C-alpha cells in the first residue's frame, strides 16, 4: 500500500471540508488512514494514507 489522493470513478475527485469523513471512507475502503487535504494540486480533496493496489487514486484526465 502507498499514500495518494483517493477518489471515485469515473476519474472524479472527492471534495472535503464539508463532510469531514475522509478518514472513515479511506479506512473502510481498506486504507491505513485518511483525512481532508485542504490545499492540494487540484484544491481541497480527501487524501488517503497507505492505499492498496486494488484501490487506485485519481488520475490526470477527465471525469466520467
- Contact, 19 vs 31, CB < 8 A? no
Gap between the Cα atoms of 64 and 17, Å rounded: 23
Instruction: In whole angstroms, give the CA distance from residue 45 to residue 35.
Output: 9
The total of other beta-carbon atoms located within 10 Å of residue 59's CB is: 10
Strands (E), the chain: 2-4, 33-40, 43-51
Domain 1-64, what fold? Defensin A-like (3.30.30)
Question: What is the domain partition of the chain in residue ranges?
Answer: 1-64
Q: Which residue has the cell 488517503?
A: 48
Q: How was this structure obtained?
A: NMR
Q: Which SS3 state, helix, strand or coil, does residue 19 take?
A: coil
DSSP state letter for 13: -
Q: Find, among 44, 49, 42, the residue nearest to 23 by Cα.
A: 49
How far apart CA 44 and CA 49 sit, in angstroms, is 16
CA-based nearest residue to 48, from 38, 35, 61, 58? 35
Amino acid at each position: 500500500v502507498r499514500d495518494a489522493y483517493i477518489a471515485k470513478p469515473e476519474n472524479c475527485v472527492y471534495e472535503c471540508g464539508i463532510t469531514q469523513d475522509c478518514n472513515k471512507l479511506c479506512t473502510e475502503n481498506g486504507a491505513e488512514s485518511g483525512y481532508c487535504q485542504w490545499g492540494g494540486k487540484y484544491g481541497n480533496a480527501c487524501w488517503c494514507i497507505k492505499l492498496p493496489d486494488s484501490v487506485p487514486i485519481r488520475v490526470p484526465g477527465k471525469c466520467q
